[PDB]
Design brief:
The complex is a heterodimer of chains A (about 170) and B (about 180).
Chain A (H helix, E strand, L loop, with lengths): L2 E13 H6 L5 E4 L5 E5 L2 E11 L2 E9 L26 E13 L1 H5 L6 E7 L4 E5 L2 E11 L2 E9 L2 H9 L1
Antiparallel strand pairs in A: 1-3, 1-6, 2-10, 3-4, 4-5, 5-7, 6-8, 8-9, 9-10
Chain B lengths: L11 E2 L10 H9 L2 E6 L5 E4 L2 E2 L6 H12 L9 H20 L4 H7 L2 H19 L3 H8 L3 H8 L3 H5 L1 H13 L6
Antiparallel strand pairs in B: 2-3, 3-4
The chains are: A mainly beta (about 170), B mainly alpha (about 180).
PDB class: protein transport
Keywords: Type III Secretion System, protein transport
Assembly: dimeric
Chain lengths: ~170, ~180
């Protein structure tokens, strides 16, 4: 009540100079992922298969990442025995999101391996591309023969990319 | 058009495969059962784990060997429960992947609701694409949502005659669109 489950389709390691030059039509090459990580507030919480359900992008949860063993039906122990003119050209990661879903806590905590989660993104409709956790663009997954990529369909201005990048 | 992009290469917009419907995994565990050692299945072919067909045709040497490549170790015709589990996982996805790339099965699969898509995967899981694509008239019937007609036709097959208890369950799923047979 209420958090966002966020599915990352891919992370694309680019240099800042490439990012400042990106324009609609540019294709960023990627490896097609088989499993992907979903996160909450930037924290990875599960790995999963992905695909579509009813034309919506969706996840089949494979593994919870570092799950907590439920021991709430027993008393807490006092101890645990387990106790600028020239800008530097930095590498920057673009995150491409398959989509997000808003879920309640109760709902989030009640999924395990094999849980199917529907995302708010439609298949075909462009994906969010982020920088430092900020939306800067949209793109579409695209492929020739054997090679996969992400084609930029829409993007903010260089000055604004820089702005989201720094913060 | 939504955008005005300069297009050099022939890039094709990609959409991922549909996820397998529920409850196909439980469904298939019921019909395929589990064996951790190579056996001849209800259609005479060498199988392992949860309905994992090893060789289309004779014999054990190739079976044990294609098992050896499937698992990635010496196996000696015997695998682990969690090896069987991971083969199963792969198999279910590969079945769906194959249906969606099958010029004949794909329009039928698309037609069907989720429960009936499970039934179709179950068939393909059992007989393979080429086998299931042979039920021409039952398929067209399925595509056209004539449930009783497809259902009664499906009971008139070799498939049904060779495995009546499984085929009945699958045909009950096709007919009803429900899970009551499971």
């Amino acid at each position: 009540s209420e958090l966002e489950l966020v599915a990352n389709f891919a992370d694309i390691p680019l240099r800042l100079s490439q990012i400042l030059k990106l324009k609609p039509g540019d294709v960023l090459p990627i490896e097609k992922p088989d499993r992907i990580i979903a996160h909450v507030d930037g924290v990875p919480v599960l790995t999963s298969q992905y695909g579509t359900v009813n034309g919506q992008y969706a996840l089949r949860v494979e593994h919870l990442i570092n799950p907590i063993l439920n021991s709430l039906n027993e008393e807490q122990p006092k101890n645990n025995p387990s106790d600028i003119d020239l800008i530097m050209d930095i590498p920057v990661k673009l995150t491409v999101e398959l989509g997000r879903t808003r879920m309640t806590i109760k709902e989030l905590l009640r999924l395990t391996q094999g849980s199917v989660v529907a995302l708010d993104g439609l298949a075909g409709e462009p994906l969010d591309i982020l920088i430092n956790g900020y939306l800067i663009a949209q793109g579409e997954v695209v492929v020739v023969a054997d090679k996969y990529g992400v084609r930029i369909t829409d993007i903010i201005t260089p000055s604004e990319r820089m702005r989201r990048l720094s913060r | 058009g939504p955008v005005d992009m300069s297009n050099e290469l022939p890039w094709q917009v990609w959409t991922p495969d549909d996820l397998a419907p529920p409850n196909i995994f439980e469904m298939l565990r019921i019909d395929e059962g589990l064996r951790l050692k190579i056996y001849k299945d209800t259609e005479g072919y060498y199988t392992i784990g949860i309905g994992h067909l090893l060789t289309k045709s004779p014999s054990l040497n190739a079976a044990k060997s294609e098992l050896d490549k499937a698992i990635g170790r010496n196996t000696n015709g015997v695998i682990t429960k969690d090896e069987a589990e991971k083969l199963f996982n792969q198999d279910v996805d590969a079945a769906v992947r194959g249906i969606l790339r099958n010029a004949k099965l794909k329009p039928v699969y698309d037609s069907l609701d989720a429960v009936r898509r499970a039934a179709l995967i179950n068939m393909v899981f059992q007989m393979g694409e080429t086998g299931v694509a042979g039920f021409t008239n039952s398929l067209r019937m399925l595509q056209q949502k004539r449930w009783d007609e497809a259902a009664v036709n499906l009971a008139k097959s070799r498939w049904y005659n060779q495995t009546p208890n499984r085929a009945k369950r699958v045909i009950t799923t096709f007919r009803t669109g429900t899970w009551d047979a499971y």
